[PDB]
């Protein structure tokens, strides 16, 4: 790769952080979705 190193793409990291398991810095999964059913809010305004 001293013959053709690069690519013409402006998003590649400048770190290349390696296999990072068994650290305080690794991956956890979660839900990449917004609110499902949107529960109701009671009115703060009272009566009686």
């Amino acid at each position: 790769p001293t013959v053709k190193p690069p690519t013409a793409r402006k998003f590649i990291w400048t770190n290349h952080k390696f296999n990072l398991s068994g650290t305080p810095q690794q991956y956890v999964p979660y839900s990449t979705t917004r609110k499902k059913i949107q529960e109701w809010v009671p009115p703060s305004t009272p009566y009686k």
Binding site: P24, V28, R34
Partner: protein
């Protein structure tokens, strides 16, 4: 190019962040909530809207058989830009 939640962590490109009365925040404790910090909404606006000097034009996306198939889009909107659904980038016309 990211926002930051009022809880103090990074939101995603989708507004999916948590409230104060959750527990998946506490399963995020100790290990980093990863987020791709290079979004996709703002990368469209940095592109030059090409002004092609014809009427009805073509789009492939940088490479034959490497990208999305041929879509031929129309440019008859005299003030609006024709948008490829695949590419996501705009066009104009100049006779």
């Amino acid at each position: 190019g990211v926002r930051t939640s009022p809880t103090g962590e990074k939101v995603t490109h989708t507004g999916q962040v948590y409230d104060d009365e959750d527990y998946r925040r506490v399963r995020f404790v100790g290990r980093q909530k990863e987020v791709n910090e290079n979004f996709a909404i703002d990368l469209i606006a940095e592109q030059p809207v090409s002004q092609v000097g014809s009427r009805v034009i073509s789009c492939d996306g940088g490479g034959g058989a490497l990208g999305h198939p041929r879509v031929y889009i129309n440019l008859d909107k005299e003030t609006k830009t024709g948008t490829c659904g695949y590419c996501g980038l705009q066009f104009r016309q100049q006779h």
